Scaffold this active site. Structure first.
Site, PDB file in Angstrom:
ATOM      1  N   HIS A  93       0.980  -0.808  -0.683  1.00 19.82           N
ATOM      2  CA  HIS A  93       0.215   0.049  -0.071  1.00 19.82           C
ATOM      3  C   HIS A  93       0.788   1.137   0.146  1.00 19.82           C
ATOM      4  O   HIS A  93       0.384   1.993   0.006  1.00 19.82           O
ATOM      5  CB  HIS A  93      -0.904  -0.304   0.760  1.00 19.82           C
ATOM      6  CG  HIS A  93      -0.785   0.036   2.660  1.00 19.82           C
ATOM      7  ND1 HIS A  93      -0.501  -1.126   3.513  1.00 19.82           N
ATOM      8  CD2 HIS A  93       0.390   0.992   2.948  1.00 19.82           C
ATOM      9  CE1 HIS A  93      -0.063  -0.270   4.614  1.00 19.82           C
ATOM     10  NE2 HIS A  93       0.348   0.831   4.460  1.00 19.82           N
TER      11      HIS A  93
ATOM     12  N   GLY B 273       2.706   5.044   9.751  1.00 15.62           N
ATOM     13  CA  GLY B 273       4.609   5.201   9.352  1.00 15.62           C
ATOM     14  C   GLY B 273       4.855   3.726  10.325  1.00 15.62           C
ATOM     15  O   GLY B 273       6.540   3.726   9.510  1.00 15.62           O
TER      16      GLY B 273
ATOM     17  N   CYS C 148       4.040   0.990   9.315  1.00 14.68           N
ATOM     18  CA  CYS C 148       4.151  -0.122   8.879  1.00 14.68           C
ATOM     19  C   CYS C 148       5.672  -0.460   7.577  1.00 14.68           C
ATOM     20  O   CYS C 148       6.731   0.001   7.857  1.00 14.68           O
ATOM     21  CB  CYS C 148       2.878   0.226   7.345  1.00 14.68           C
ATOM     22  SG  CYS C 148       1.344   0.655   8.145  1.00 14.68           S
TER      23      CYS C 148
HETATM   24  C1  LIG Z   1      -0.026   1.762   8.159  1.00 14.70           C
HETATM   25  O1  LIG Z   1       1.757   2.298   8.303  1.00 14.70           O
HETATM   26  C2  LIG Z   1      -0.587   2.490   8.603  1.00 14.70           C
HETATM   27  C3  LIG Z   1      -0.634   1.932   9.912  1.00 14.70           C
HETATM   28  C4  LIG Z   1      -1.006   2.760  11.386  1.00 14.70           C
HETATM   29  C5  LIG Z   1      -1.732   3.495  10.994  1.00 14.70           C
HETATM   30  C6  LIG Z   1      -2.661   4.365  12.162  1.00 14.70           C
HETATM   31  C7  LIG Z   1      -2.328   3.974  12.744  1.00 14.70           C
HETATM   32  N1  LIG Z   1      -1.512   3.056  13.502  1.00 14.70           N
HETATM   33  C8  LIG Z   1      -0.693   2.250  13.032  1.00 14.70           C
HETATM   34  O2  LIG Z   1      -0.422   1.444  13.274  1.00 14.70           O
HETATM   35  N2  LIG Z   1      -1.729   1.531   8.587  1.00 14.70           N
HETATM   36  C9  LIG Z   1      -2.848   2.054   7.738  1.00 14.70           C
HETATM   37  O3  LIG Z   1      -1.895   3.477   7.527  1.00 14.70           O
HETATM   38  C10 LIG Z   1      -2.689   1.546   7.071  1.00 14.70           C
HETATM   39  C11 LIG Z   1      -3.773   1.763   5.541  1.00 14.70           C
HETATM   40  C12 LIG Z   1      -3.270   0.436   4.385  1.00 14.70           C
HETATM   41  C13 LIG Z   1      -3.644   0.716   2.851  1.00 14.70           C
HETATM   42  C14 LIG Z   1      -4.218  -0.222   4.791  1.00 14.70           C
HETATM   43  N3  LIG Z   1      -4.453   1.553   7.213  1.00 14.70           N
HETATM   44  C15 LIG Z   1      -5.601   1.478   8.685  1.00 14.70           C
HETATM   45  O4  LIG Z   1      -4.379   1.232   9.381  1.00 14.70           O
HETATM   46  C16 LIG Z   1      -6.713   1.702   9.413  1.00 14.70           C
HETATM   47  C17 LIG Z   1      -7.783   2.298   7.417  1.00 14.70           C
HETATM   48  C18 LIG Z   1      -8.705   2.185   8.177  1.00 14.70           C
HETATM   49  C19 LIG Z   1     -10.270   2.552   8.345  1.00 14.70           C
HETATM   50  C20 LIG Z   1     -11.318   2.401   9.268  1.00 14.70           C
HETATM   51  C21 LIG Z   1     -11.288   2.291  10.406  1.00 14.70           C
HETATM   52  C22 LIG Z   1      -9.350   1.843  10.892  1.00 14.70           C
HETATM   53  C23 LIG Z   1      -9.185   2.304   9.757  1.00 14.70           C
HETATM   54  N4  LIG Z   1      -7.568   2.252  10.539  1.00 14.70           N
END
Ligand SMILES: *[C@H](O)[C@H](Cc1ccc[nH]c1=O)NC(=O)[C@H](CC(C)C)NC(=O)c1cc2ccccc2[nH]1
Ligand SMILES: *[C@H](O)[C@H](Cc1ccc[nH]c1=O)NC(=O)[C@H](CC(C)C)NC(=O)c1cc2ccccc2[nH]1
Lengths: 300, 300
Positions: A41, A143, A145
């Site tokens: 992603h 960040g 990920c």
């Molecule tokens: C990767 O860096 C990040 C990890 C993250 C983000 C926010 C909080 N904690 C974390 O560990 N992962 C993401 O941003 C992912 C993106 C990809 C495309 C899956 N998305 C989410 O983590 C996310 C999306 C979403 C929609 C609705 C409810 C919760 C939710 N979480």
């Protein structure tokens, strides 16, 4: 003496953590030999993450749209491939610090160390357990990920986890290093459920065993019970069922302590039915299931 | 998202962990430049540890009675000195992997990462807090001595702890890297007391703040109280007294969350008086005081 949640030393893994940037998205990668692994992603914009077609998105990208940084040095991307939810960026320079390593798919109830990284730089280490619903209870911000989960067996780093996602409940989901998710998750910004979280009964019993080895014995009871009867009461409490293999695993621990597994299952049963009455075991006012029997033995 | 006990990445420190042997006793040392640091009771037999005169024991020893091993390589000891409870073995080869480093004496309530070592080889990492009674609650077996506690600030490893002893209660005592014990402990096999263990109130309040930031808010109360009145109730519960400096430290956390320190102190007061009623905060059925405000901020 004492029992603490411990993580593996992170040194071999720190030397493999790079920064991957594709457009405005920056994530951590894992640089082993001439291959960098990161969550796919990275190739997404905030609009795309709602309904992404990853084949189409990547077909638009070229090797030169991927920035890989190792400290300051820039690795030259000479290849790109998608394996499941993981992007494999082939590069020019093999990692000199590649440790001996293997990719493993852990099973639920097993534990691993996580090196939590921001921008390709390590920030901290903690120990996680693959929950039964294939989630983990970590500390990941945006960040994080591409941060990875690992075990160290002898000289060999077994990579088992790469972080991709936080769920609405705040738990964390990710893949193995072949890009297959743990659990029924997809790398899309959609509402997703892990389902009913259950307790790794074999781990709670290894923990009770660690408590006895460290001197906490109050929970020990003169009763005993049967496997099936224990499992009868356990399932009520969303505890995973115990098996004779489970029993054989807890064997060297039932030996060391002179307490039979079925004797402990009765003592666990009283604690589920009668609470803990405000006491503590090993400094916890709740029952801990994030230590495997192996974890307990390696410490004890 | 999420809050977990995290330790610093251990890589810079792994590269400084050697094995020191003097007779039948083997311990871990810390190899920085051309100097190795270890606990001085390495020069003791099991008989001597009952009533040791360390000047006399060491005067009997010569550079050649000290075996320092780095992996397989053997370092040649060309010097020996005693600084407080620490033996300084001067050696021929400077450690190529010496990280930038400093020796600090932490104060009570502060936390540090421990790399637990057996035979000069790392086994695991966990985070510890200097208790108010100058003990730590770790996971140390025989052979863990010379294992070190550290913080990583930017590029600089601040070494603050070397492990020497387990007490009868199972807690752990050790020194700074100048050989001065934390607390009223002596490196002798005698019964020794730490005294009354008290709770780092400033840390519990940073933890409550981490809980609110991660979504746990049930404990929050509409009441408020005064510093002195809070301290009145706290001391009853062997909680360390809060100060206006403490309050200023929790300041950026009271800002972020919109909850005043005195509002939180009232919510903590209800929890001390009324228990937790079987609920959990941040997955704990007890109040946690092993996170400093800085720890919480670095994570959040
Ligand atoms: C990767 O860096 C990040 C990890 C993250 C983000 C926010 C909080 N904690 C974390 O560990 N992962 C993401 O941003 C992912 C993106 C990809 C495309 C899956 N998305 C989410 O983590 C996310 C999306 C979403 C929609 C609705 C409810 C919760 C939710 N979480
Ligand atoms: C150092 O390797 C070792 C650490 C240790 C030993 C056993 C369990 N856990 C541990 O962390 N430290 C010691 O063996 C020291 C020896 C020096 C001379 C202080 N002694 C003890 O830790 C010790 C002695 C003693 C007497 C009575 C009760 C408890 C007790 N503990």
């Amino acid at each position: 003496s004492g029992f603490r949640k411990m993580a593996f030393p992170s040194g071999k893994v720190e030397g493999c953590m790079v920064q991957v940037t594709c457009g405005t998205t920056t994530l951590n990668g894992l640089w082993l030999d001439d291959v960098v692994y990161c969550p796919r992603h990275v190739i997404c914009t905030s609009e795309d993450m709602l309904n992404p077609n990853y084949e189409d998105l990547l077909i638009r990208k070229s090797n030169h749209n991927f920035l890989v940084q190792a400290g300051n040095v820039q690795l030259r991307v000479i290849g790109h491939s998608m394996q499941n939810c993981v992007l494999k960026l082939k590069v020019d320079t093999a990692n000199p610090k590649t440790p001996k390593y293997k990719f493993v798919r852990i099973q639920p109830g097993q534990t691993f160390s996580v090196l939590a990284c921001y921008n390709g730089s390590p920030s901290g280490v903690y120990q996680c357990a693959m929950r039964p619903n294939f989630t983990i209870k970590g500390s990941f911000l945006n960040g994080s990920c591409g941060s990875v989960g690992f075990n160290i067996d002898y000289d060999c780093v077994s990579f088992c986890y790469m972080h991709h996602m936080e769920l609405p409940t705040g738990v964390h989901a990710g893949t193995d290093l072949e890009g297959n998710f743990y659990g029924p998750f997809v790398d899309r910004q959609t509402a997703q459920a892990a389902g009913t979280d259950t307790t790794i009964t074999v781990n709670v019993l290894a923990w009770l065993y660690a408590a006895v080895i460290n001197g906490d014995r109050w929970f020990l009871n003169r009763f005993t019970t049967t496997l099936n009867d224990f499992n009868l009461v356990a399932m009520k409490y969303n505890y995973e069922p115990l098996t004779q293999d489970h029993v054989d695993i807890l064997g060297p621990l039932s030996a060391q302590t002179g307490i039979a597994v079925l004797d402990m299952c009765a003592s666990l049963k009283e604690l589920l039915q009668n609470g803990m009455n405000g006491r503590t075991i090993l400094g916890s006012a709740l029952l801990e299931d994030e230590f495997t029997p192996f974890d307990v033995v390696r410490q004890c």
